[PDB]
Amino acid sequence: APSHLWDIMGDRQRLGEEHPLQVARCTKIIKKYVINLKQIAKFVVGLGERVSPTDIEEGMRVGVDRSKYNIELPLPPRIDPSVTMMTVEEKPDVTYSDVGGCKDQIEKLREVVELPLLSPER
């Protein structure tokens, strides 16, 4: 059912010659951008159509077109590691009141961690 609504855009978001982009990283910036590919190949191009001159930064992954290389959209850096994506947890089951006792070792951790996050102006 949800696939039928996305097939209408299939005449644009699919058959277009833009989307087949080659991802790479710009090694050198001259304000001419030296960009190194994943195949151990480099080239030099300029800005794109919607590309802003201040968006491209030194040492950032920048996707380019597959046929005629041109900067199209920037991408966040450090795309290689897949390991740290699973290190972030969500909603731990242990709550704040699960630690037994009134011991002051609890008060020391909340003031050095929870306090500056909740009340940074204190």
């Binding site: 090694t27 050198k28 001259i30 001419k32 030296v34 190194n36 195949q39 151990i40 190949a41 480099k42 030099v44 040492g59």
Partner: protein, 62 residues
């Protein structure tokens, strides 16, 4: 003999081309990264005062 230049692309392809007037033989040196045309394989560009790159970690602070 004549003046010419032997270039090697980053794709490991060795191409022979004659000396182009855009560059000079005294300015050219071995182990130099310059540009070439994708079709005709001729040097249209000079060296932008840097060879290779900074690779990964480089710290430049004012």
């Amino acid at each position: 003999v004549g003046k010419a230049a032997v270039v090697k692309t980053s794709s490991r392809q060795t191409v022979f081309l004659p000396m182009v007037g855009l560059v000079d033989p005294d300015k050219l040196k071995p182990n130099d990264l310059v540009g070439v045309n994708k079709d005709s394989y001729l040097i249209l560009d000079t060296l932008p005062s840097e060879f290779d790159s900074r690779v990964k970690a480089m710290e430049v602070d004012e």
